[PDB]
Amino acid sequence: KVIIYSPARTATQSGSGKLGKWKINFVSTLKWENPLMGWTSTGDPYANVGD
Amino acid sequence: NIGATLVGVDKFGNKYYQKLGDTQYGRHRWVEYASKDRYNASQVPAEWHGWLHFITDHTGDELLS
Amino acid sequence: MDNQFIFKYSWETLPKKWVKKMERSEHGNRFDTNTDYLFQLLCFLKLHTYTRVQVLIDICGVDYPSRKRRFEVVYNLLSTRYNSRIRVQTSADEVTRISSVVSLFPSAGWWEREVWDMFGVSFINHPDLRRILTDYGFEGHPLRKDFPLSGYVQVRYDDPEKRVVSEPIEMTQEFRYFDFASPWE
Amino acid sequence: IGVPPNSANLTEARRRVFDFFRAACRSIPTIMDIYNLQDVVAPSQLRYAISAQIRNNAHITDPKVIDLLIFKGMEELTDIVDHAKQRHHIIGQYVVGGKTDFLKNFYTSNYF
Amino acid sequence: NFTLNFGPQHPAAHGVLRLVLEMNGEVVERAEPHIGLLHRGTEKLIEYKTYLQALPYFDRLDYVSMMAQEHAYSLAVEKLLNCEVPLRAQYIRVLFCEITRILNHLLALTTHAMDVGALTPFLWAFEEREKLLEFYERVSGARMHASFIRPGGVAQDLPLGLCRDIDSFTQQFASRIDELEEMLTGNRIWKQRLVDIGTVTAQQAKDWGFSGVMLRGSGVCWDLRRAAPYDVYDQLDFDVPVGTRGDCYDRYCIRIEEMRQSLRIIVQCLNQMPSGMIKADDRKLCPPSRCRMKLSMESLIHHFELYTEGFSVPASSTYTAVEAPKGEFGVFLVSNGSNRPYRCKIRAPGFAHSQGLDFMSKHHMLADVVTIIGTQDIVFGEVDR
Amino acid sequence: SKAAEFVISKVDDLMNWARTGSIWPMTFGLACCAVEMMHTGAARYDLDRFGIIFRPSPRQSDCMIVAGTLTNKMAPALRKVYDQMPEPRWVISMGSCANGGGYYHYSYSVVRGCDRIVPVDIYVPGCPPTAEALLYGLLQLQKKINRRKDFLHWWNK
Amino acid sequence: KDWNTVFERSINTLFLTEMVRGLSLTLKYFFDPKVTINYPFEKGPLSPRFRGEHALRRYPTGEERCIACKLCEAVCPAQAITIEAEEREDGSRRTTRYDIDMTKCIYCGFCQEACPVDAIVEGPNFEFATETHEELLYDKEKLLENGDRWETEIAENLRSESLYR
Amino acid sequence: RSKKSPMELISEVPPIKVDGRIVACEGDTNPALGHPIEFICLDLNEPAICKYCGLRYVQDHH
Amino acid sequence: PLLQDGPPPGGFAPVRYARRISNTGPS
Amino acid sequence: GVGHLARKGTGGRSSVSGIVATVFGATGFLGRYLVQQLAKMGSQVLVPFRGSEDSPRHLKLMGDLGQVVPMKFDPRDEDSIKAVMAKANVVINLIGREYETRNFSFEDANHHIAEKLALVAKEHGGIMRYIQVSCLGASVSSPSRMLRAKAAAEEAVLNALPEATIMRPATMIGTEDRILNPWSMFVKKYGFLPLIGGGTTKFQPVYVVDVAAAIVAALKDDGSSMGKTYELGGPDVFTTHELAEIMYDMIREWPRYVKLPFPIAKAMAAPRDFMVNKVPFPLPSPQIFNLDQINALTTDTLVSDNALKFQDLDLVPHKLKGYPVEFLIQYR
Ligand SMILES: NC(=O)C1=CN([C@@H]2O[C@H](COP(=O)(O)OP(=O)(O)OC[C@H]3O[C@@H](n4cnc5c(N)ncnc54)[C@H](OP(=O)(O)O)[C@@H]3O)[C@@H](O)[C@H]2O)C=CC1
Ligand SMILES: CCCCCCCCCCCC(=O)SCCNC(=O)CCNC(=O)[C@H](O)C(C)(C)COP(=O)(O)O
Ligand code: SF4
Ligand code: SF4
Ligand code: SF4
Ligand SMILES: [Zn+2]
C-alpha cells in the first residue's frame, strides 16, 4: 500500500525549487539497529526507491 | 650490509643502512631487524617509515626534532 | 560531413513520414522516429551514398517513468567515410516489441540482448533474445527506475544444504540516500 | 529462432499459449535425465505445475501481456533445459504444494 | 559435434573467461562467450552518485587503462557544462593518457605472449610497467586507480622531479621496446602462431563495430585522435599505423607501432608543456585552494557546496568517445538538471570485440583460440559493467 | 611427557616449517586486483623467493587468493573451486571487493564479501592493495600457519 | 628469385639463425644485476601523497580536530563512513561515533581532501592486513590510535603538499 | 596520559592573553595547516572559546 | 607558487624512438 | 522462563533474536546444523572449541558478523569454561564421544564434562535455557558403556538444574553421519557390507536437521519444555537390513551381505578394546566395528510409546528415503 503525494517546501528555506514533483511513498519503516556497530539494518527493498 | 653506511639506530634496536646509487639503484635503503622471531614484518616506527619508503629524505632522528 | 550538411541533406532526401523530430545542435544531430519505421530508416542510412553510416556504436535504453511510452531506445551511429555521427531514437513501453536491426548491423545482437536484460524491451526477429548480463534465473530488469538498487534477493552459502542458495535481501547497513537538492536551483 | 511478431488478437495468444505448453510438456523427459528427477517426482506432477501456472495467469486479456508472459516462460524453460540453474531450484519452484490468521500474524509481528 | 567448456578461473587467461565451444574434430565451429560474471551493476550505481562521486567507477572499468576512461568521463562532463580547460591541464591529461596507452599495450602484448608460451618478455615488460606506475603513484596517491583526471581541470599539480624522471624513462624505453620486439618479432614460432590466424576484413570490422587496433589492422585508417581530435592532440605529431592482412600478426606490429608513437607523443608533451593553472577558474565547478577555503567566506561556501552536493549539469544528453588503448571508449551521459546523472551508458570496446570472437575463431584449431582471445586485448571489467 | 613435550614439539615444528616454506596459492583473479597479484609475482618483488609459486589447478594448491569483485553468478563457481582443494587449505581475501563488496557493496549482483561463500583466514585491505600489502598478507598467513599445533593436539585427543 | 638470396634465406631456415639471436639476448640478461627487493628489510619507493591507512588527527594541544561537520561522510563515494555527533559538555561540536568500513573503502582520498580542518587523513601505512573481518571495522578509538602512532610522518607529508593543496 | 580525554586536555590549556577586543584564531602557526579563520569577540568576563580549536582567549587589560 | 614543474630551459635532450638495427652473425 | 528472545528484525540473517547461546561441542555432526539454524534467526552463538583453530572455521559463514565467535577452552580447566559462558543466556551441550581415547574415557567424555558444564552454569546464574543431548538408548542397565554414561549425565544435569531440557535423539542420518557413510566406504573398499547382528536389530533413524529444528523449537517454546526429556525419533522403524537396502539403492550397487553373528563380531572388535594403551595415546578410531556400538546394537532401540516425541513440539520428521539420504550419490 503506497501513498502518492507531492512533497512540500521546507520551513528552513524560502526557495521553491524542489516543488511540483510527485513521489510514491512505500511506507518503508521496518528498520532496526545492527548489534555490532549500531548501523541501521533493513530487509525492505523499497527502502529508498521512491526517494 | 657490506660496504654500507649505517644511517642510524632505532629505539627497538633496528639498524638502518644506506648505499649510494648511480644509475640503476638497488639495496640503497634497508633495515637490519634486531629481532629474528619472524620480525613481525612491521616494526618500523613512523619516524623511520618515511625514510625507508623514500617518502622523505629526513633520516628519522632529524624527524624527531 | 558536418552537422550543418547532414541535417539539411536528410531533411530533403529522407521520406517525411519516417522522422517526426529533428534536433540540430553541437551535442548531436538526433532523429526521433516511430518504432515501425526504425528498420527502414537505419537501412536507408546504411546504403545511401551520401549518408554511408556503416558502424553501429551502441544501443542504449533510457527509462522515463513519467511518460506514457516509458522507454527510450537510442541508436548511436557512426559514418567512417564522412567522419560524422548520427543518433536515432525511438520510444517503447513495457509490452511493445520493436524491430531488431541485427540484419543490418551484426553487432546489434549483444546490445539488444543487454537492452532486453536491463529494461525488458523485446526485439522482433532477433536470433536469440536471452539475458546476457544478469545471473541465471534473475527476475526483474535492474536498469528500470522502479527497481531497487540492491535488488530483491541475496546470495549466501548454506552449509546444511551444501550449495550456494538465494535468500531475500537483508542489509546489515542500509543504503543512506542523501538529498543534496537545493530549493534555489 | 527469432522472436515472433507481436500478436493482434486473443486467439493468436491462446494458440501461442498452447504451443508453449506443448513444448514445455515435451521438455519434461529431458529434465528427468539432466537432473536426477527419476526417483523424485512423477512425470505428471510437473505437467500439473505448468498447467497451474498457466491457469492462475489466465485472467489476462491483453495480447501483448500474454505474449510477454509466454516469452518469459520460454526463457525460463530454455534456462532449465540447460544446466544453468542448480538442481534444488526447480525442486524449490516446481513442486505442487487453528485459531485465526489475524491472531497468528499478531503473535508474529506488528508489521502485517 | 561435442560441446566443450573452457572456464579458466586462473588468471593465466583473463580469469573470468567462459567459452562454450562446439568442436567438430580439433576445429572449433562456434564460440559462444558466456559473460556476466563481472557484471557489478556499475551503470545503475552511477545514477545514485554525484558527478564527482561517480568518477572513481571509471577507473575500475578498464583496469589496465585507467586514465583513458576518466578522460572520456571528464570530457563528457565538460561538453555538457561548457567548461574550458587550461592548456597545462590539457597537456598533463594527454601526457598521462599516452603513459596509460603504453601501460595497456605493454600488459596486453606480454599477457598475450605468455598465453602462447613466451614467459621471458612478461617480466621484462612488467619492470617497465612498474617504472611507469611509479609516476602514477607520484601525481596521485594510488598506483592503479588514480582519480587524477577530473571534469574541471586535473586533480592536483605535478611534483618537482616528475618531468625529469619521465624524460629519463623515455631515454631507454626505446631500447626496451627493441628488446621486446627482438624476442618475438623475428621468431619463426611466433610468426607461425600468429600469421593468418584471426583474419578480419574491413567490412567485417565495420559491421561488427570493431575499433582501435582491431579496426586499423584491416586497412581502415580510423584514429579518433585524428578524426575527432580532443585536447591538444591536434598540436602533436604522430603517425597512425595501418595493417595490410588483418591477421593476428598485424595486430601485434600495430600494437608495437602505437606504443613507439606514444613514446613520441610523450616526448613532445614533455617538451611543449606550458606553465599556468591546472583547473578551470569557475570555482562554481572546481574546488577552491585549501588556503583560500580557510581564509575567504565564499571559497568556504563553494567548498562546502561542492563536496556535498557537487555541481549541477544542465538538462541535456550527449555521446563523447575517446581513443582508448583498446579502441573507441564512449560515454552516453544523460542529465536532467540535477547533481546526479540520470543515465550513463558505458560503451566498452571489449563488448564489441568479444562479440566477434564467434566469426574470428570459426574453423580454427583449438590452440589458436587463445591467440584470438589475446589479440583483442579484452578485460572483463568493461565487457560486463 | 619427558620426551613428548620435546619430540612432539620438534615434529610439529618440522611440519610448520615445511608448510610455511612451501605455499602454493591458487590465484582467483577476477578484477583489477589480478593486476596487483601479477605485479607481486613479477621480478620487482619476486613472490617465488619465499617459496610461493602459483598453481592453475585447485587439486595441487593449498591456498586460494580471492582478489576481485565476487558476483552472484560467480559465487557457485568460487565455492566449487574451493571444495576441490586438499584439507590443509587457507583463503586470503584481497581488496575491498573481496572483503566486503567494496565499491559495489550496494549492488544487486555483487556478493558482499567472499567470506559469505568461503571461510577466509587473512583479509588484505586496499583498492587495489599494494604489492607489498599482499606480501604482508602472505607473511601474516605464514605467521598464522606457525601457530598451528596439529600433532600435539592429535596426541592430546 | 636470386640464387644468392635463396641460399641465404635457406641457410637461416636450417641453421636457426633467428633463435640464436634470442638465446644470446636471454643469456645477456642472465649475467646482469637483479631488480628484486628484499621486502621484509627494504621497501619499495613511495610518495608523500600515498593513500594508505586512515588516521584521525588531533591538535598539538591534545584536542581532536574533527568537528563533526559530516563533510567527509557526504563525499564518500562508497558510503564507508558513519558519524554520530552531539553537543559535548563544553558545548563544542564533536563526534561520539566515527567509524570507517575498510571493507567498503576504495581509498580514493575524497574524505581527506574534503575535511576543512585536516582531521581525517590517509597515512603512509599500507601493512594492516587482519585475520578477522571485524578488525577491519575501524572505529574512533582505532583511528585516533592510528593518528597518534603516525603523527610525525603525517605532519611531514602535510607540510610537503601544503605547497600543492 | 591516555586516561585524559580531549575535553580534559583542552580544559587545562591556560587562556591566551590578548590586549585588544577581538582576536583571530587560525588553529596553527602555519595558516594553511589549521582550521578556517575565526574572529572572537573578547567583550565578556569569561574566557572566549574557539569553536574549532577549543582554545580560550581572554582580554588582557580591560 | 612561481616555481612550477616543467621542462628545463632549452628543452630536454632528443630521444630515439625508432627500431635500432642489429647486424649480428656471420651467416 | 520467558525473557530469552526479543525479535528485532525480519527473521533473517541480519535480523536480531535475543538469544546468545554457547554451544559446546559444535564442531561435530549435530553442531554444524544447530549453529546454522541458530544463526538464521539472528542469534549470537559462542562456539567453544579445543585443539586446532581450523575445526570451527566452517561455522563463521553461518553468522553475519560476530554472530559466531569461536573461543578456545579446555574441559579439564574450569576458569576457561566460565570465561566462554559469561555472555550467554542459553547453554547447549553436545559434548560426547562414542569411542574411547586414553585421554578421555567413556565416563569422562560423556558424564564428567556434562557435570562440570551444568555446575558452572549453576554458579554462573543467568542461563535461562540449558539443553543436554543424550542418546535415545540411554539407560543404566544398557550393556554399552557409552549409553550408561549418557544416562548418568542425564540425572546429573537434571539434579544440577531442574529447568534443563534433555533432548534425547536416536541414530542420526546426514551428510556427515557415522553410520551410512562408513557403510558406503566399506562397500567401496571391500565389496560387501558386514552385519554384526544379521540385520535384525530395530532402530529409528532420524534426520539431523529434524533434531536441530527440534532443539530450536524447544528453545523457542511457550515454557512447556523446561524440565522435560524429549525422545526424538524418526517416522519409520527401520532395521540394519532395510537401511542397508536403501543405502544400496542410493549407491547403485548389487547387494552383497555377509551375515555375522554377535559373538564373532564382538571378538573381532575386542582387539582395540585391550589395545587402547600403547606407545601412542592416539589409535585409529573404529569405523563399523566399535565394540560399544556392537553391544548397543543388541537391544532394539525405539522411541518409548509413552514418552514425548516430535509431534509434541509441532514438528514432522522428514521421511528418510528421499532428500535426507540424497548425499549418497557421491559414491554413485
Ligand atoms: N548418530 C549420532 O551422531 C548420535 C549422536 N548423539 C549424541 O549427539 C551429540 C553430538 O552428536 P555428534 O555431533 O554426532 O557428536 P560428534 O561426536 O559428532 O561431535 C563431538 C563433539 O564433541 C566434542 N568432544 C568430544 N569429546 C570431547 C572431550 N573429551 N572434550 C571436549 N570436547 C569433546 C568434539 O570436539 P573435537 O571434535 O574437537 O573432539 C565435537 O565437537 C553427542 O553427544 C552424541 O553422543 C546421540 C545419538 C546418536
Ligand atoms: C520445467 C518447465 C520450465 C517452464 C515451465 C513454465 C514456466 C512459465 C509458466 C507459464 C507462465 C505464463 O503465465 S504463460 C501463459 C499465460 N497466458 C494466459 O493465461 C492466456 C489467458 N488465458 C486464457 O485465455 C484461457 O484461460 C486459457 C488458459 C488459454 C484456456 O482457457 P480457454 O481456452 O477455454 O479460453
Ligand atoms: S577492491 Fe578495488 S581494485 Fe580490488 S577488485 Fe574491488 S574495485 Fe577492483
Ligand atoms: S578514501 Fe574515499 S572511500 Fe575511503 S573513506 Fe575516504 S572518501 Fe570514503
Ligand atoms: S573528519 Fe573532517 S570532514 Fe569528516 S566529520 Fe570530521 S571534520 Fe568533518
Ligand atoms: Zn581556533
mmCIF file of C-alpha atoms in Angstrom, chain H residues 17-23 42-43 58-62:
data_model
loop_
_atom_site.group_PDB
_atom_site.id
_atom_site.type_symbol
_atom_site.label_atom_id
_atom_site.label_comp_id
_atom_site.label_asym_id
_atom_site.label_seq_id
_atom_site.Cartn_x
_atom_site.Cartn_y
_atom_site.Cartn_z
ATOM 1 C CA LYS H 17 46.080 36.954 26.888
ATOM 2 C CA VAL H 18 45.007 39.374 24.140
ATOM 3 C CA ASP H 19 45.306 43.140 24.506
ATOM 4 C CA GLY H 20 42.586 44.079 22.019
ATOM 5 C CA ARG H 21 38.827 43.492 21.999
ATOM 6 C CA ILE H 22 38.974 40.920 19.175
ATOM 7 C CA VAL H 23 41.367 38.111 18.245
ATOM 8 C CA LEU H 42 36.590 39.375 23.878
ATOM 9 C CA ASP H 43 33.870 41.597 25.396
ATOM 10 C CA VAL H 58 40.716 36.386 27.398
ATOM 11 C CA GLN H 59 41.155 40.147 27.270
ATOM 12 C CA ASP H 60 44.373 41.336 28.872
ATOM 13 C CA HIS H 61 43.791 44.731 30.487
ATOM 14 C CA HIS H 62 40.197 45.919 30.084
#
